[PDB]
């Protein structure tokens, strides 16, 4: 029975979407990446919707709303994979119908990116990350996304402050045994940022190599980096 912003982000959390890899297409690197880029395109729509439930996000200018999402979108996608993967060992749950082990990662050419995502999984598993913390960190990653293009720096700082205050209140209430738990959660964000950079670089390379079709929204978010 905790912080109201945390409560709200929990009920704002979107429903899972399925990858639905085309069962008429033969299994290949191109099929795996096409499947993952299609899933990312669809999850970006859901993410834009979610961001509007984040208290105060909708009061920013449309330019600032776009700036935060263009900076943070891959971090938010990664955190979803991470959260879904916490009850697994050495597997990434991209979706309930798309669980990637080492074998599938090698076949997709994603072994290095997927190993970095697994390092995030193993850290949050050792901290026993709760859904409450997951949704709060997702929002903080959006607010703290270091865009060079913000118009109202004070308004974005205020959003950062509101969500950080929510995280601190939740940990103070729920995790009295570890007075440093909120800071330990914030100290996971550098590896999240690092992994997002590697993922965006990787998918940018795939876009240039021209062999994997990609939807308009995914390509626009990739172009913005």
């Amino acid at each position: 029975p905790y912080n109201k912003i945390v409560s709200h982000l929990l009920v704002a959390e979107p429903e899972k979407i399925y990858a639905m890899p085309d069962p008429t297409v033969p299994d290949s690197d191109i099929k795996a990446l096409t499947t993952l880029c299609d899933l990312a395109d669809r999850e970006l729509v859901v993410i834009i919707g979610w961001a509007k439930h984040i208290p105060g996000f909708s009061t920013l200018s449309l330019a600032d709303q776009m700036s935060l999402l263009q900076s943070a979108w891959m971090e938010i996608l990664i955190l979803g994979v991470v959260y879904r993967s916490l009850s697994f060992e050495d597997e990434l749950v991209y979706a309930d119908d798309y669980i990637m082990d080492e074998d599938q990662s090698k076949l997709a050419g994603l072994l290095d990116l997927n190993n970095a995502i697994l390092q995030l999984v193993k850290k949050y598993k050792s901290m026993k990350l709760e859904k409450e913390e997951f949704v709060t960190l997702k929002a903080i990653a959006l607010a703290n996304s270091d865009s060079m293009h913000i118009e109202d720096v004070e308004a974005v700082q205020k959003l950062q402050d509101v969500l950080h205050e929510a995280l601190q209140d939740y940990e103070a209430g729920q995790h009295m045994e570890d007075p440093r738990r909120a800071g330990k959660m914030l100290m996971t964000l550098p590896l999240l940022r690092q992994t997002s950079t590697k993922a965006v670089q990787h998918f940018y390379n795939i876009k240039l190599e021209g062999k994997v079709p990609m939807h308009k929204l995914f390509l626009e978010m990739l172009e913005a980096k």
Partner: peptide
């Protein structure tokens, strides 16, 4: 113009 903007203005 951007689909991101479109979806931010939508519904």
């Amino acid at each position: 113009n951007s689909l991101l903007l479109h979806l931010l203005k939508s519904q």
